[PDB]
Amino acid sequence: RPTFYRQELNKTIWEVPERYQNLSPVGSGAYGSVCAAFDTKTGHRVAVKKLSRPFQSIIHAKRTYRELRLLKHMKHENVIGLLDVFTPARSLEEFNDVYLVTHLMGADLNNIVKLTDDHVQFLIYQILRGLKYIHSADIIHRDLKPSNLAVNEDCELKILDFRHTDDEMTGYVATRWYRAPEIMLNWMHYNQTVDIWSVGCIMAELLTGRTLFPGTDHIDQLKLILRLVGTPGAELLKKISSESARNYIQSLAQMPKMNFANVFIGANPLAVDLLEKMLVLDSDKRITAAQALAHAYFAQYHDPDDEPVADPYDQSFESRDLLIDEWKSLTYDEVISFVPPP
């Protein structure tokens, strides 16, 4: 066990191993607080997050366990990984606080977004390489958007930030602009094809410099989507499971899918083709991450021997009913069993 030292930064007590020096606040919120630091053991600049109220309810305790399980599993060049996890507690009985450590990330895609076609190829390639890995473990990201994609000075990219309130999704908000239409109004339960819809929205924005579907509310956004990709046809309508969805969509005048070469004027024809394959209304028919990596748009970067899959991820805990102290003990076990990367 390392020696810990204490300090107060912006009215919060931080107790961390001596290896972490020069802590300085970088943000806070309902989730907790985050500090940048220098890790003297690895020489990396790091982000240290202290969770707030990690075991305040059953929902909160299960969410703390879920985050730690997901971060401990991720081991891929284009996905955030866990450098360390610690608690100052010496026993389960005095266990209360959890701290998570990752590489300190600089810019996100929001800040970067002059993007040439070569830049778009490399950025979207890396997103899809990371998504092939995530999806191979049967993990769904569910919230892909530019602020959740970190990028360094050499255009290298990592996916991060794997529930949002109803108020957070209301109105003219980027928190909703990248969501697939089948989940935006809860017509359907999540499945991994929703992440490919988000990639299409992000890729379009990198090519044009503009949000693809900047709706002022859920209904406005659906109308923007259906104008581009068309109203549902006979084949898809037959498959729609929600009755209130069926009835509302049938109230809209029918519209054909637009010509994407006239929407994305001047773009690489291979980029237009890939966008037509991601932005399909019927989610069954969307291209997958593994299929997209082999599309000719990525000819300069595709290497089928260097696009790895993930170890299996057991999420049977998601359907388990446990008490707060049982979720807390499971979390404690995962803290003390952590093994750092080489």
CB 82 within 8 A of CB 100: yes
Written as one letter, the residue type at 225 is I
Which of ligand LPZ, Cl ion, none is residue 161 near (CB under 5 to 8 Å by kind)? Answer: ligand LPZ
Rounded to whole angstroms, the Cα distance separating 279 from 49 reads: 36
Is 314 catalytic? The answer is: no
Q: How far is the CB of 175 from ligand LPZ (least distance, A)?
A: 9
Q: How far is the CB of 79 from Cl ion (least distance, A)?
A: 7
Residue 157 dihedral angles phi and psi, to the nearest 5°: -125, 145
Q: Which of 97, 108, 118, 161 is catalytic?
A: 161
Q: Give kind and range of the element (H or E) at residue 150.
A: strand 149-151
Q: Among candidates 97, 85, 78, 311, which has minimal Cα distance to 199?
A: 78
Q: Which is nearer to ligand LPZ, 159 or 212 (CB)?
A: 159
Determine, following the binding rule CB under 5 A, whether residue 89 of this chain makes contact with Cl ion.
yes
Tell me the DSSP string of 177-241: HTS-HHHHTTSS---THHHHHHHHHHHHHHHHSS-S---SSHHHHHHHHHHHH-S--HHHHHH--
Determine, following the binding rule CB under 5 A, whether residue 340 of this chain makes contact with Cl ion.
no
16 is in an annotated binding site: no
Rounded to whole angstroms, the Cα distance separating 248 from 245 reads: 5
Determine, following the binding rule CB under 5 A, whether residue 18 of this chain makes contact with Cl ion.
yes
Q: Establish how many alpha carbons lie within 13 A of residue 245's alpha carbon, considering only the half-sphere containing its beta carbon.
A: 18
Which of Cl ion, ligand LPZ, none is residue 268 near (CB under 5 to 8 Å by kind)? Answer: ligand LPZ
Identify which range of 103-111, 188-196, 265-273, 330-338 contacts Cl ion by CB under 5 A: 103-111
- Binder of Cl ion out of 168, 217, 235, 314 (CB under 5 A): 314
Written as one letter, the residue type at 101 is V
263 is in an annotated binding site: no
Identify which range of 117-125, 146-154, 283-291, 306-314 contacts Cl ion by CB under 5 A: 306-314
Q: Can you tell me whether residue 43 is helix, strand or coil?
A: coil
Q: How far is the CB of 35 from ligand LPZ (least distance, A)?
A: 9
- Binder of Cl ion out of 4, 12, 19, 105 (CB under 5 A): 19
Determine, following the binding rule CB under 5 A, whether residue 96 of this chain makes contact with Cl ion.
yes
Rounded to whole angstroms, the Cα distance separating 131 from 166 reads: 27
Q: Bridge-partner residues for 39, per DSSP?
A: 20
Q: How far is the CB of 240 from ligand LPZ (least distance, A)?
A: 32
Q: How far is the CB of 276 from ligand LPZ (least distance, A)?
A: 16
Size of the site for Cl ion (CB under 5 A): 12
Q: Which is nearer to ligand LPZ, 68 or 131 (CB)?
A: 68
CB 287 within 8 A of CB 131: no
Binding site for ligand LPZ (CB under 6 A): 29, 31, 34, 47-49, 100-102, 117, 161, 266-269
Written as one letter, the residue type at 77 is E
Q: Among candidates 125, 128, 146, 144, which has minimal Cα distance to 136?
A: 128
26 is in an annotated binding site: yes
34 is in an annotated binding site: yes
Identify which range of 12-20, 209-217, 227-235, 299-307 contacts Cl ion by CB under 5 A: 12-20
Annotated binding site for ATP: 26-34, 49
Annotated binding site: 26-34, 49
Active site residues: 161
